[PDB]
Design a protein around this nucleic acid. Structure first.
Lengths: 568, 548
RNA sequence: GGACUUAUAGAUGGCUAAAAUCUGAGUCCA
C-alpha cells in the first residue's frame, strides 16, 4: 500500500577509487527514474551520506550528510536534481579528497511518518563488511530503537549481526544489482475479472436466455458450475505515447501540452477540381447501413431490432480430442476460466477441477457458447484444459486446474479457397507437372538445413509453468532486487518465450536519453546497443554448422456519389 | 476489388429429376438453393460482388436465342434476391413446378442450345458497360451442365471454332469454373469439354474439366465463391549469409465479421440529401485553437515529455527490426514443444510461396513442407507482416495431409509481457484430499462427457453468427417492406422456436438438454443411464457443500 | 463523491483494419 526507502552511500577512499560510488549511482539513477514514471503518492525516497566530509543533518552529527530530503511523489525533474547533486559531489572529491548515520535516519523517519502504516526500509552501499566495529552494546541499542528492515549491498560476521537481528533483512552483491537493472523485467499486471457467470451443460434455453437470474443451479438435469473469466494472453503495443503540441516557456526544454479531440461533421460541395467542406450539425446526420447495392436509414425502433439480445453465459456444446480440432481455428486472445469460490460455494472449485482433470487425462477440448455481457457478441469457443503450478506450503507440488477460452470462427468468418498444389504440382487443367530434376539432392540438403538449426536442445517451459500465479511475483518492496526464485531464472532458455524486445528498447533508450541530455548536459545523443542477451533471442540458432551455398544453387534462388443509393 | 460471377446452367431431363444423392432433391433445385445461400452470404461477406444467372435451352417466350435470364450480371441486391426467393416459394407452395417455370417437358427430346451462341453470349455479357456498376477486376463463369456429349461433339470444325471462342474469353480475362455433373448410374465423359476448354504456355492451360458428383455441387459452389484476400507478402529469410532468401504470401483464413461496420453518413436538411463525413479535430487546451495536423507524438516520462527525431526513431528500431515486412528463420523445433491450444493471441495466416518475387520459392517451400512433415517439426520465425507494426515471434507449421490446401500456417507467439498472470483464489481446496470422493466425481464426469462427443468435429459452417444474421435480416425486411413476425404476446413455445431459428448454437443446446430429459422418461435401462449419471453428479455437488 | 493503485493499465474503433481513438479499471473510506 505505502512504503518509504532511505538510501545510504559510503564515501570512503575505497569506494571512490574502486568506482563503487559511480556504480551505486547507476542503480540509484535507474531505480528513481523508473519510480518517476509512476509518480506514486505513497512511495517515499530519502538519501544520506556516510563517512562524508560534509556535515549537514537534523541532529547535527558529524560525518553525516542528508543530500536529499524525504520526497513523495518522486518526479523526473527531482530525480534529475538529486543525481546531479551527487554527480557534483562525486566529481569534486574524485582525486584531491557510519554508526551514528544509521541512528540519524531512524530519528528522521519517526518524525516524518510517526506511527502510520508504512513499510520502512534502509538501503546501504558499502565495501569491506569485515572492516567495521559495532559493539554488542550498539547492536543491543540498534535492535530496540529500529522498526525498519535493512538491505545491505557488498561492493568489495560483524555486519551480519545487524542483518540477523533486524526482521526481514537481506544482503546482496553490487554486480548482483548491476545485472538485475540491465536484464529485461516482465511487468506484473494484477488480474482483473472480465466475466462472472455459469458454466452449463443441459441448461434450459428459456431459463438462461433471459435477464432473470433463473437459477440453473437448482436444476437437477443440468451441470452448473459458477465460474469466472480472466485474461490469459493480451497483446501489447509498447509504451503508451502522448499526443501533444509544443509550447514555449522561460526554460525552453522540449515543453509539451496534451491535446484533446472532438468529432465534427461536414459535407462536400464540389466545384476534377475539388470540394468545399462545410461543417454541419450531428443532428442533421444519420447512419446509413449497407445492404448490397443499397444503403438504408432505419427508423429508430428498427435500429434497436438490429441488436441481437444475448445473455451472459458459458454453455457446453460438446467435447472432442485435441487433435480433432484444427489449430488454426483459434482466432482470438485467450482467457482463463476459473471456478467462482467468491460468489459461489466450494463445490464449484471441486466440480470444476474434476472436469478439467478428466479433460486432461483424456486429452479433450470442449466446444462452448460464450457471452460475456448482455447484448455482447456471441462466440463459439474452445475450452482447453491447463495446469498452473503454485508454490505450496507442503513439499509436494500444487497444480491448480483451469480452462483456457479462445474464440472459434463462425460460418461468415472462413475465407478458405482452393490453393494450387505444392507437392505433386499440376497445370491449371490438372495434368501432372513434370517432376523436378535434382529433386533428391534438394530434399537431402534441406533435411540437413533443418537439423542445423534444431533448437530441441533448448528446453520447453516445465509442465504447468507457461502461466504463472500472481502470488509468486508479488514482493514486499518496489525496489529492483534479484528474483531470489531458483526456478524462475534460467527458465528463460525457452526460445518461444522471449522478452518484449521493442518495449525494452524503448525503456533502454529513454533512460540513456535522460542520462546524457538531462543529467550530463550533453548536446549529442549516443543511442546504446541492444544487449547481446536480447539480440540472441531474435537471431538464428546454430545447432550444427552448415553451408547452404550448395542448397541455394540447386534450388535456383534468384530475386526478380451517394445520395440516391438511399432506398425505400 | 470487384469480382463478378456468371451462372450458366444447362437444362436436361436428369437435371429436373430428384436424385437419391441429393436427399431426393432436383440438381436444378439444388443449384437454385445454392445461389440463394451464396447471395445471402456474400451480402454480409463481400457485397461488392456481381452475380448473374442464365438458363438454356429454355423454351420461354422471353428467352433470347434459347438463353433465359433469371437476372443480369449486377452487384448483389435485394431485388434480385427477392426474385429468387419468390421463385423458391412458388415451388414450395406447389403453386408451380420447375417444369412449369422453365417450360420444360418430359418428352425425351427437347431442344438444345447451340454452344456457339452460348460462348459468344458469355463474352458479350462481360464486355457490357453498365452505368451504376463498377468495372470488374475478376470475371468468372460458373458452368453447370449434365450433357457429356452435346450435338456439336461430332463436328470437328465446330470444335475448332469453339476453341477460338474459348480462347477469346481467356484473352478477355474470363475464367471458367466448371460444374460437370455425374451420377451413380450416369457418369460424365469430359472428353468433349476437355478439347474446347484446353489451351495450346505451360502453367495456364484452361480450367479443370474433371466431373463431380451432384452430392458435391452446393459445397463446391460455396467454396469457389470466396476470393483469396492477400494479407501480406514479404521475403522469407532462411540463411542471410548465402542469400538463402525466398518469397512468401500470406492469407487470412478466418476473419472476425462484425455487424454495423458497413455504413455511410447522410446529411439531410429540408430538400438537401447529401453524404456526410466524420472529421476528427484536435484542439489546444490552452487557446482552443485547431491544431489538427500540427500535433506530435511523445513519450511521457513522469513530469517530462520526450520527443525523438525520425532519425533517432530509425536507430531505435534498427536494433531489432527492418523497415519493410520480413520473416527470418530463428530455428526449427518439434511441434509438440511449439504449438498449444492454450496460448493463442492472434488469428492464423496461410503461407504460400511467392515465385513472382523470388524464383525457386516453390521448390524451396515444397521441400520444406515435405521435410517438416516428415520430422513433425516447425519453424521459429522473427519479423513482421506489415511495415507499420511491431515484430514478433511466429510459429510456422506445415499443412496437414488431411487438408486439401498445401502450405503453412502462421501463429503469432506471445511475448513474455503478453502472458498474463493467473488470478489468486480465495480457496485452493478442490477436494483432491479426499481421494475416493474426488475420484468418483471424475468418473461420473467422464461418463457424462462420453454422451456428448463431436464425431464430426467443429465446422464453422454449422454456426452462423446470430448478431450478423439479425442485423442483415432487419435491413433486408425493411428494404422489401416485409412486416416483422415478432409478437410481444409470445408463448414460451413460440419464444423457444424463435430463439433456435435466430441462433444455430441455441438449437444445439436445446438438443443436449432434450437428450438428458428423454433419458429420464425412457424406461429402457440402457438409455436411462445418462440422466442417472447427471443426478449422481449433482448428488456429489450437494454432498460436498454439506460437508465442506 | 473522495484517497490510493494501475498507464507494458481499462476500454473503443473497424467495408477486416489506423504505428488510429478514448480514459478507463481495481481496491479502500462517506
Amino acid at each position: 500500500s505505502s512504503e518509504s526507502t532511505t538510501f545510504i552511500v559510503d564515501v570512503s577512499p575505497s569506494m571512490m577509487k574502486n568506482n563503487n560510488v559511480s556504480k551505486s549511482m547507476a542503480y540509484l539513477e535507474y531505480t528513481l527514474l523508473n519510480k518517476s514514471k509512476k509518480s506514486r503518492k505513497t512511495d517515499w525516497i530519502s538519501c544520506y551520506l556516510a563517512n562524508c566530509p560534509v556535515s549537514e543533518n537534523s541532529q547535527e552529527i558529524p560525518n553525516v550528510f542528508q543530500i536529499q530530503s524525504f520526497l513523495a511523489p518522486v518526479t523526473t525533474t527531482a530525480t534529475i536534481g538529486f543525481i546531479k547533486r551527487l554527480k557534483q559531489y562525486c566529481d569534486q572529491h574524485s582525486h584531491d579528497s557510519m554508526i551514528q548515520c544509521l541512528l540519524v535516519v531512524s530519528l528522521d523517519i519517526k518524525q516524518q511518518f510517526q506511527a502510520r502504516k508504512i513499510l520502512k526500509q534502509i538501503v546501504v552501499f558499502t565495501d569491506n563488511l569485515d572492516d567495521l566495529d559495532i559493539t554488542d552494546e550498539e547492536i543491543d541499542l540498534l535492535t530496540e530503537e529500529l522498526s525498519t528492515r535493512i538491505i545491505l549491498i557488498d561492493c568489495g560476521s560483524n555486519w551480519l549481526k545487524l542483518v540477523e537481528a533486524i526482521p526481514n533483512s537481506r544482503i546482496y552483491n553490487m554486480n548482483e544489482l548491476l545485472v538485475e537493472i540491465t536484464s529485461p523485467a516482465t511487468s506484473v499486471v494484477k488480474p482483473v475479472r472480465v466475466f462472472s457467470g455459469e458454466l452449463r451443460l443441459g441448461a434450459d434455453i428459456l431459463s438462461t436466455q433471459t435477464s432473470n437470474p433463473s437459477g440453473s443451479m437448482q436444476d437437477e438435469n443440468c451441470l452448473c458450475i459458477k465460474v469466472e473469466a480472466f485474461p490469459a494472453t493480451k497483446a501489447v503495443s509498447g509504451l503508451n505515447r502522448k499526443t501533444a503540441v509544443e509550447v514555449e516557456d522561460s526554460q525552453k526544454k522540449e515543453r509539451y501540452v496534451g491535446v484533446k479531440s472532438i468529432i465534427e461533421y461536414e459535407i462536400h460541395n464540389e466545384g476534377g477540381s475539388s470540394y468545399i467542406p462545410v461543417t454541419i450539425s450531428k443532428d442533421s446526420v444519420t447512419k446509413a447501413y449497407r445492404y448490397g447495392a443499397d444503403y438504408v436509414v432505419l427508423p429508430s425502433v428498427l435500429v434497436d431490432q438490429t441488436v441481437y439480445e444475448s445473455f451472459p453465459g458459458l454453455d457446453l456444446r460438446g467435447f472432442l480430442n485435441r487433435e480433432a480440432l484444427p489449430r488454426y481455428f483459434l482466432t482470438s486472445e485467450s482467457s482463463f476460466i476459473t471456478a467462482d469460490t467468491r460468489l459461489g460455494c466450494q463445490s464449484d472449485l471441486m466440480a470444476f477441477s474434476a472436469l478439467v482433470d478428466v479433460m486432461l487425462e483424456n486429452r479433450k477440448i470442449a466446444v462452448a457458447r460464450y457471452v460475456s455481457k448482455k447484448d455482447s457478441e456471441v462466440n463459439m469457443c474452445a475450452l482447453c484444459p491447463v495446469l498452473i503450478e503454485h508454490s505450496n506450503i507442503n513439499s509436494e507440488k500444487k497444480f491448480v486446474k483451469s480452462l483456457t477460452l479462445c474464440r472459434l470462427p463462425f460460418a461468415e468468418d472462413e475465407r478458405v479457397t482452393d490453393f494450387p498444389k505444392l507437392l505433386d504440382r499440376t497445370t491449371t487443367s490438372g495434368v501432372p507437372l513434370k517432376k523436378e530434376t535434382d529433386g533428391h539432392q534438394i530434399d537431402e540438403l534441406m533435411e540437413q538445413f533443418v537439423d542445423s538449426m534444431d533448437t530441441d536442445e533448448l528446453p520447453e517451459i516445465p509442465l504447468g509453468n507457461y502461466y504463472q500465479p500472481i502470488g509468486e511475483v508479488t514482493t514486499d518492496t518496489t525496489l529492483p532486487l534479484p528474483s531470489l526464485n531458483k526456478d524462475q531464472e534460467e527458465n528463460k532458455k525457452d526460445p518461444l518465450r522471449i522478452p518484449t524486445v521493442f518495449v525494452y528498447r524503448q525503456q533502454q533508450v529513454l533512460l540513456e536519453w535522460i542520462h546524457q541530455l538531462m543529467i550530463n548536459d550533453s548536446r549529442e545523443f549516443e543511442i546504446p546497443e541492444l544487449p547481446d542477451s536480447l539480440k540472441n533471442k531474435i537471431s538464428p540458432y546454430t545447432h550444427k554448422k552448415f553451408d547452404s551455398t550448395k542448397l541455394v544453387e540447386v534450388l535456383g534462388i534468384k530475386k526478380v456519389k451517394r445520395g440516391e443509393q438511399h432506398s425505400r | 476489388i470487384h469480382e463478378g460471377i456468371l451462372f450458366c446452367i444447362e437444362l436436361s431431363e436428369t437435371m429436373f429429376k430428384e436424385s437419391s444423392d441429393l436427399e431426393y432433391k432436383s440438381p436444378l433445385l439444388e443449384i437454385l438453393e445454392s445461389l440463394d445461400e451464396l447471395m445471402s452470404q456474400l451480402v454480409i461477406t463481400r457485397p461488392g460482388t456481381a452475380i448473374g444467372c442464365y438458363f438454356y435451352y429454355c423454351n420461354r417466350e422471353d428467352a433470347k436465342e434459347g438463353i433465359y435470364e433469371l437476372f443480369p450480371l449486377r452487384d448483389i441486391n435485394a431485388t434480385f434476391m427477392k426474385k429468387l426467393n419468390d421463385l423458391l416459394e412458388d415451388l414450395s407452395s406447389g403453386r408451380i413446378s420447375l417444369y412449369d417455370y422453365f417450360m420444360f417437358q418430359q418428352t425425351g427430346s427437347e431442344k438444345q442450345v447451340r454452344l456457339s451462341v452460348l460462348f459468344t453470349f458469355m463474352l458479350d455479357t462481360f464486355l457490357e458497360e453498365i452505368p451504376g456498376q463498377k468495372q470488374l477486376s475478376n470475371k468468372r463463369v460458373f458452368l453447370f451442365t449434365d450433357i457429356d456429349k452435346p450435338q456439336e461433339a461430332q463436328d470437328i470444325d465446330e470444335r475448332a471454332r469453339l476453341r477460338r471462342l474459348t480462347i477469346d474469353l481467356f484473352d478477355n480475362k474470363v475464367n471458367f469454373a466448371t460444374f460437370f455433373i455425374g451420377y451413380a448410374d450416369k457418369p460424365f465423359d469430359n472428353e468433349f469439354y476437355s478439347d474446347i476448354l484446353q489451351l495450346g504456355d505451360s502453367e495456364f492451360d484452361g480450367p479443370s474439366t474433371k466431373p463431380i458428383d451432384a452430392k458435391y455441387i452446393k459445397s463446391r459452389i460455396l467454396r469457389k465463391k470466396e476470393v483469396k484476400r492477400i494479407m501480406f507478402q514479404c521475403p522469407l529469410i532462411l540463411d542471410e549469409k548465402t542469400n538463402f532468401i525466398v518469397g512468401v504470401k500470406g492469407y487470412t483464413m478466418y476473419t472476425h465479421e462484425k455487424a454495423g461496420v458497413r455504413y455511410k453518413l447522410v446529411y439531410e436538411h429540408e430538400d438537401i440529401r447529401q453524404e456526410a463525413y466524420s472529421k476528427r479535430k484536435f484542439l489546444n487546451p490552452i487557446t482552443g485553437e485547431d491544431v489538427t495536423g500540427k500535433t506530435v507524438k511523445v513519450y511521457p516520462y513522469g513530469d517530462l515529455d520526450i520527443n525523438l527525431s525520425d532519425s533517432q526513431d530509425q536507430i531505435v528500431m534498427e536494433a531489432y527490426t527492418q523497415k519493410d515486412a520480413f520473416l527470418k528463420i530463428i530455428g526449427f523445433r518439434s511441434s509438440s514443444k511449439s504449438i498449444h491450444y492454450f496460448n493463442n493471441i492472434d488469428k492464423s495466416s496461410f503461407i504460400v510461396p511467392d515465385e513472382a518475387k523470388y524464383e525457386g520459392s516453390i521448390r524451396t517451400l515444397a521441400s520444406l513442407l515435405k521435410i517438416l512433415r516428415k520430422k513433425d517439426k516447425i519453424a521459429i520465425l522473427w519479423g513482421k507482416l506489415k511495415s507499420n507494426s511491431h515484430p514478433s515471434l511466429y510459429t510456422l507449421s506445415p499443412s496437414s495431409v488431411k487438408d486439401y490446401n498445401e502450405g503453412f500456417y502462421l501463429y503469432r507467439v506471445p511475448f513474455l509481457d503478453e502472458i498474463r498472470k493467473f488470478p489468486s483464489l480465495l480457496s485452493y481446496d478442490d477436494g483432491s484430499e479426499h481421494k475416493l470422493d474426488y475420484d468418483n466425481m471424475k468418473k461420473v464426469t467422464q461418463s457424462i462427457m462420453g454422451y456428448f462427443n463431436l464425431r464430426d468435429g467443429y465446422n464453422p459452417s454449422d454456426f452462423k453468427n446470430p448478431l450478423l444474421q439479425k442485423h442483415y435480416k432487419v435491413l433486408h425486411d425493411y428494404l422489401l417492406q416485409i412486416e416483422t413476425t415478432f409478437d410481444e404476446n409470445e408463448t414460451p413455445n413460440t419464444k423457444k422456436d424463435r430463439m433456435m431459428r435466430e441462433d444455430d448454437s441455441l438449437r444445439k443446446l436445446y438438443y443436449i438438454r432434450n437428450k438428458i430429459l428423454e433419458s429420464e422418461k425412457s424406461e429402457d435401462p440402457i438409455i436411462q443411464r445418462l440422466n442417472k449419471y447427471v443426478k449422481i453428479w449433482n448428488m456429489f455437488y450437494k454432498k460436498f457443500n454439506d460437508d465442506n
